[PDB]
Amino acid sequence: ITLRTYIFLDALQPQLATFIGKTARGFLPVPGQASLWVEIAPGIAINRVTDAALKATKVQPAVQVVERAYGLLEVHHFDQGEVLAAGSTILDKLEVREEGRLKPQVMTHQIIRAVEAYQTQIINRNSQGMMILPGESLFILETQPAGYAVLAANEAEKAANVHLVNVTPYGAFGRLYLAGSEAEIDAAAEAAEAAIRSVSGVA
How far apart are the C-alpha atoms of 190 and 203, rounded to whole Å? 23
Q: 3-class SS at 139?
A: strand
**Nearest to 179, CA basis, from 126, 123, 105:** 123
- Give the contact letters, 9-48, x = binds to other proteins (CB under 8 A), - = no: -xx-x------------------x----------------
Helix-strand-coil split of the chain, %, nearest 5: 35, 30, 35
Among 84, 94, 107, 140, binds other proteins (CB under 8 A): 84
Q: How far is the CB of 34 from its own copies (least distance, A)?
A: 14
- Binding residues (CB under 8 A) for its own copies: these are 1, 14-15, 17-23, 25-32, 42-45, 47-48, 50-51, 54-55, 60-61, 64-66, 68, 70, 107-108, 110, 112, 115-135, 138, 140-142, 163-164, 171-173, 175
Binding at 160: pick from its own copies, other proteins, none (beta carbon under 5-8 Å per type): other proteins
- Taking CB under 8 A as the rule, does residue 182 contact other proteins? yes
Which of 2/88 has CB closer to its own copies? 2
Binding at 17: pick from its own copies, other proteins, none (beta carbon under 5-8 Å per type): its own copies
Binding at 39: pick from other proteins, its own copies, none (beta carbon under 5-8 Å per type): none
- The alpha carbon dihedral of 12, 13, 16, 18 has a sign of positive
Task: Please provide the DSSP assignment of 157-190 as one string.
Answer: HHHS--EEEEEE-SSSSEEEEEEE-HHHHHHHHH
- Give the contact letters, 99-138, x = binds to other proteins (CB under 8 A), - = no: --------------xx--------------------x---
How far apart are the C-alpha atoms of 43 and 145, rounded to whole Å? 15
- The alpha carbon dihedral of 79, 87, 161, 18 has a sign of negative
β-sheet with 174-180: strand ranges across: 105-112, 137-144, 174-180, 163-168
Count of CB atoms situated within 10 Å of the CB of 89: 19
Q: Point out which residues bind other proteins (CB under 8 A).
A: 10-11, 13, 32, 55-58, 78-82, 84-85, 113-114, 135, 158-161, 182-184, 186-188, 198
